[PDB]
Amino acid sequence: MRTRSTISTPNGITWYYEQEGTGPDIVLVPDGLGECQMFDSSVSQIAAQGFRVTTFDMPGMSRSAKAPAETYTEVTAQKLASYVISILDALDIKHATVWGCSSGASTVVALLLGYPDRIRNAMCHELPTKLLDHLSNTAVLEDEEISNILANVMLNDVSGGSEAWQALGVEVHARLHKNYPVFARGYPRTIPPSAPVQDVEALRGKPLDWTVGAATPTESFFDNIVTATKAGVNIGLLPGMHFPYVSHPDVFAKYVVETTQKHLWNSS
Amino acid sequence: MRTRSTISTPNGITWYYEQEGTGPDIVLVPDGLGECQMFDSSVSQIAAQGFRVTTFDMPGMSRSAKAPAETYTEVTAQKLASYVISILDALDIKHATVWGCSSGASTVVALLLGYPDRIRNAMCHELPTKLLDHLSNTAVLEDEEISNILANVMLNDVSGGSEAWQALGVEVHARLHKNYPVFARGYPRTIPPSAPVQDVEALRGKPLDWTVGAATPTESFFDNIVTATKAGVNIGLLPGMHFPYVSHPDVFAKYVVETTQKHLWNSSS
Ligand SMILES: C[C@H](O)CCC[C@H](O)CCC/C=C/c1cc(O)cc(O)c1C(=O)O
Ligand SMILES: C[C@H](O)CCC[C@H](O)CCC/C=C/c1cc(O)cc(O)c1C(=O)O
Numbered sequence: 001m002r003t004r005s006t007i008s009t010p011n012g013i014t015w016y017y018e019q020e021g022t023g024p025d026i027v028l029v030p031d032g033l034g035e036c037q038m039f040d041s042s043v044s045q046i047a048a049q050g051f052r053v054t055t056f057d058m059p060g061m062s063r064s065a066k067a068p069a070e071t072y073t074e075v076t077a078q079k080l081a082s083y084v085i086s087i088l089d090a091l092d093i094k095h096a097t098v099w100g101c102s103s104g105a106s107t108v109v110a111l112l113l114g115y116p117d118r119i120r121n122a123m124c125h126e127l128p129t130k131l132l133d134h135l136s137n138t139a140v141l142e143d144e145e146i147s148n149i150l151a152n153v154m155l156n157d158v159s160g161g162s163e164a165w166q167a168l169g170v171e172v173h174a175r176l177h178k179n180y181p182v183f184a185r186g187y188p189r190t191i192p193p194s195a196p197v198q199d200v201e202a203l204r205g206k207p208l209d210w211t212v213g214a215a216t217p218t219e220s221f222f223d224n225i226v227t228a229t230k231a232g233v234n235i236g237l238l239p240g241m242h243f244p245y246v247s248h249p250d251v252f253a254k255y256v257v258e259t260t261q262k263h264l265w266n267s268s
Numbered sequence: 269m270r271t272r273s274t275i276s277t278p279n280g281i282t283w284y285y286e287q288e289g290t291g292p293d294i295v296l297v298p299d300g301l302g303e304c305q306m307f308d309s310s311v312s313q314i315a316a317q318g319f320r321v322t323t324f325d326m327p328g329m330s331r332s333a334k335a336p337a338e339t340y341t342e343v344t345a346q347k348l349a350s351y352v353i354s355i356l357d358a359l360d361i362k363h364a365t366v367w368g369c370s371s372g373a374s375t376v377v378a379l380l381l382g383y384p385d386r387i388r389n390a391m392c393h394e395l396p397t398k399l400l401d402h403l404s405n406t407a408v409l410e411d412e413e414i415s416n417i418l419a420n421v422m423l424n425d426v427s428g429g430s431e432a433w434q435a436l437g438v439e440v441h442a443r444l445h446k447n448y449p450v451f452a453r454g455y456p457r458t459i460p461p462s463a464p465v466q467d468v469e470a471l472r473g474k475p476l477d478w479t480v481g482a483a484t485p486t487e488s489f490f491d492n493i494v495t496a497t498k499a500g501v502n503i504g505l506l507p508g509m510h511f512p513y514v515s516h517p518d519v520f521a522k523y524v525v526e527t528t529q530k531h532l533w534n535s536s537s
């Protein structure tokens with residue numbers, strides 16, 4: 001019942017995508033590691049509630065690696081939003097609910113603000129607005145050292161569940177190992193400054209639902225809570241840290257379903 | 269240069285307190301464990317910047333244990349604020365900057381709202397507004413089990429620094445051992461519903477500086493960040509978790525001094 005296929009867009013990207021279900025469109029945008037297998041359990045649970053769910057690997061990452069260098073270098077929320085619109089155009093998805101974490105969160109807020117006719121509502125999780133020198137400095141290391149360091153960071157610092165993270169399995173971790181250097185050299189210097197949350201008044205009244213991880217250290221996304229509250233945007237918590245769709249897939253799925261249902265009611 | 273003494277207030281409490289320094293008054297209200305030795309390093313560093321610093325063990329706790337049962341049972345922010353005003357009256361402290369964490373945070377916001385002529389400015393850290401059934405349920409246990417459970421929670425989960433926590437020393441931990449059952453039976457069921465943050469408009473424009481621990485799990489005091497932001501109150505982070513004066517005493521002292529200095533400049537304007 002799950003489609004697993006590839007599709008080429010006129011910007012040069014060959015996307016790997018997955019799709020399951022019928023009904024209103026929900027699109028799950030990966031975090032910066034660009035790996036859509038992290039959504040696998042949740043895709044079936046969401047689709048089973050009457051939705052068409054689409055996800056994809058991000059350009060330059062995992063099975064979407066056949067892409068021009070511009071799509072995975074000097075990456076911004078606005079570039080990623082343009083790329084997501086390209087694949088939604090290719091798949092004839094005219095109106096969608098979107099979810100994203102991390103650079104995915106920056107991407108879905110850019111999607112909602114830039115393409116309002118295309119976006120029913122956006123769920124953003126842990127949107128990075130601050131430069132981290134420790135992360136930006138990994139870009140000058142050798143690929144194998146980047147992969148070793150960032151594999152450790154993801155498991156021990158931000159996975160929000162070491163057993164679930166490791167249970168993604170050897171095939172997923174082998175793809176992430178190859179993504180870490182692409183992510184390190186493309187994302188951490190350019191993503192945070194591109195955060196589309198500098199204009200608080202532009203967020204006010206928008207169909208945005210913002211979350212942070214319950215277990216995440218307060219300092220990590222303190223600024224998200226402040227910004228959301230200043231904008232009057234719905235702000236709450238999911239269990240775990242940076243990857244709730246990995247750590248707590250059933251809670252994640254229920255959240256996506258209930259949030260989409262609330263906006264479908266509000267739209268009529 | 270530290271005064272270490274006792275003072276009896278007509279509400280029945282015999283307080284243990286400490287004082288150091290001369291200058292504008294800064295008062296350090298303990299968290300619910302009620303133990304003012306946790307401020308020892310910071311009291312000297314703050315006083316050295318030209319302040320008179322006062323702290324005290326809280327009623328029923330540590331060396332302030334000679335107190336009526338009303339002062340350490342069914343404890344509310346409003347009761348604690350009335351008790352702090354009683355010791356400030358007894359020490360002739362008319363106008364003070366105040367710090368408090370946890371129930372001490374609830375106390376200092378209650379002091380600022382309820383006694384505004386007495387409070388130059390308040391610094392509140394990790395103010396509890398939510399009931400926690402797992403903590404409330406400890407009240408029905410025997411004293412020794414309460415002490416073992418909460419000693420473990422403070423050391424390993426919320427100290428923000430296990431080595432600094434242990435370095436409080438054997439005498440402090442012997443006092444905290446006796447305080448854990450008093451705290452368990454008198455605080456967790458009644459402090460959160462008494463939180464003086466139901467009226468966001470009452471906080472607006474008040475000389476309040478609110479912090480949360482940088483390492484604290486987001487869920488613990490997420491509501492503090494939301495409430496402070498809604499009220500336009502200065503909200504920020506200190507290193508560590510629930511006990512910044514234990515985990516990061518020099519950062520804590522600097523924050524108390526700089527915040528007090530900011531309000532002294534503003535008061536003159
Ligand atoms: C050795 C170093 O200190 C590493 C320690 C710091 C941790 O890496 C923080 C981990 C999560 C970073 C998210 C993030 C940040 C960003 O600026 C752009 C992004 O796209 C993302 C994302 O995961 O997508
Ligand atoms: C056995 C369980 O799992 C215990 C686990 C939970 C952590 O103990 C508490 C985290 C911080 C809250 C303290 C607190 C709460 C309150 O309702 C009144 C107070 O006065 C305080 C205070 O420290 O003053």
Ligand SMILES: [K+]
Pocket residue numbers: 247248249250251252
């Ligand atoms: K789950």
Ligand SMILES: [K+]
Pocket residue numbers: 515516517518519520
């Ligand atoms: K320090």
